[PDB]
Amino acid sequence: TAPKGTIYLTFDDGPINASIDVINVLNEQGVKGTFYFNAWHLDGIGDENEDRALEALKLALDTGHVVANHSYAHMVHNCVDEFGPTSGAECNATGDHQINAYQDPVYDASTFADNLVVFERYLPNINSYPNYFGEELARLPYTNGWRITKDFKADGLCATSDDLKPWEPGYVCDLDNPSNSVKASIEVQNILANKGYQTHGWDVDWSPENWGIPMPANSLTEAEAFLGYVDAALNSCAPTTINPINSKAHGFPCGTPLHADKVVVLTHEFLYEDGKRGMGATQNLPKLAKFLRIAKEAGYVFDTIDNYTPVWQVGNAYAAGDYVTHSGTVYKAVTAHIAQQDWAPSSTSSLWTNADPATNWTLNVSYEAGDVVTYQGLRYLVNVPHVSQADWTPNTQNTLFTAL
């Protein structure tokens, strides 16, 4: 039979000492999580208890959890005048993380690439792990932004600010004229998508109601009530209805088939530590353990973000319009069929089209009039719907494409 739904438990801002305790709680019940890591904790400059950060990274990989890319230093270089070893402490003293969080999108996007270099430096064999998805799965700091398929995208238009924090008096978000930081974050999403990343936001956040609350670890919802929030998010387009306003994923395609019967849960392992943020270990590690227990007894199953878009499999039946990933690339089924080993999705497959959320011109993509592609550094408008092929390059096809 079918589960009540699939929960994707995701943890942000590790690897830190508290990651080990969270992972041990997950391992007690065989639950796998997705960990969006910032490698500056491996360098010891992240202003957390992080001397065991490498142990935490190895533990996550060794016990089956998925490691994803959250950028090297959580955009904290944009929080200070000059980024250095004390920048995390100074941004924590001001609490200005959300202010000017994105500035130069090209440089900001490159800190996701920097993240992978540092991962490999501390763990040279990391790409021999099948659950290392640092190059293919990402999540933008502070931003409930999504890049899943060509027709499944969303952006947090109030995620970050140019001046006032979202919990401060006088804060106003204008959806028609978003902050400069939000507009830069959108460009970061598009740059990552063009490098083959998918980015995932969240439906529910196990966190303080807002990040201005003092001692945030103490105000986490109890496990039973949180399962109630998970229930309420199932098939309800929660990314658009979530509060507060800086957590919303604007433009999220409500009812899109890939999100059916799924809830992505966000939390942070630094909320599960007894320390500067409260009694997180004493209070919240038992909450996490109880939540896993009652969710599984209620009929939920837990899975990792790498399976959010199902991996193509020999012998599976696919309807027209079904989405899969094959070798990390998103494809959509052209015709209903049963997959066989020789009919894997490809750039010349007649059974699939590439449906990556990228915008570079790509082979075997079902383009629509109004789409904009980039090719040889030039942007082109699609005039006529068609499936791209090798000889229909934008620069030679004036009927299909118009250079901007």
Ligand X SMILES: N[C@@H]1[C@@H](O)[C@H](O[C@@H]2O[C@H](CO)[C@@H](O)[C@H](O)[C@H]2N)[C@@H](CO)O[C@H]1O
Beta carbon nearer to a second copy, 374 or 383? 374
Single residue of 10, 12, 78, 206 touching ligand X by CB under 6 A: 12
Residues 88-107 that bind a second copy (CB under 8 A): 106-107
What distance in Å separates the CA atoms of residue 365 and residue 348, rounded to the nearest whole number?
10
Q: How far is the CB of 318 from ligand X (least distance, A)?
A: 35
194 contact, one of Zn ion, Na ion, ligand X, none, CB 5-8 Å limit per kind: none
Determine whether the annotation assigns residue 136 to a binding site: yes
DSSP helix, strand, coil percent of the chain (3-state; round to 5):
30, 20, 50
- 304 contacts 32 by C-beta, under 8 angstroms: yes
359 phi and psi angles, rounded to 5 deg:
-120, -5
E strand or H helix at 184, and its extent?
A: helix 180-194
CA dist., res. 144 & res. 403, Å (int):
32
Contacts of 89 (CB under 8 A, 6+ apart): 47
**Per rule CB under 6 A, is residue 74 in the interface with ligand X?**
yes
CA atoms within 13 A on the CB side of 250: 15
- On whether 328 is known to bind a ligand per the annotation, the reply is yes
Give me 392's structure tokens.
């229909």
- Partner from Na ion, Zn ion, ligand X, none binding residue 92, C-beta < 5-8 Å depending on class: ligand X
Which x/- pattern over 335-374 shows residues binding ligand X (rule: CB under 6 A)? ----------------------------------------
Check if the beta carbon of residue 375 is closer than 8 Å to that of residue 357.
no
Residue 291: burial class (beta carbons within 10 Å; 0-12, 13-18, 19+): buried
Contact string (CB under 8 A) for a second copy, positions 306-335, x = contact: --------x-----------xx--------
Task: Fill in the per-residue mask, 184 to 223: x = in contact with ligand X (CB under 6 A), - = not in contact.
Answer: ---------------------------x------------
Give yes or no for residue 155 binding ligand X (CB under 6 A).
no
CB 141 to Zn ion: min, Å: 5
28 is an annotated ligand-binding site residue: no
199 binds Na ion (CB under 5 A): no
Distances in whole angstroms, Cα of residue 120 to Cα of each of 117, 190, 260, 375: 5, 25, 35, 31
* 121 near a second copy, judged by CB under 8 A: yes
The contact set with Zn ion (CB under 5 A) reads: 12-13, 141
* Binding site members for Ca(2+): 195
The contact set with Na ion (CB under 5 A) reads: 136, 196, 309, 311, 325, 328
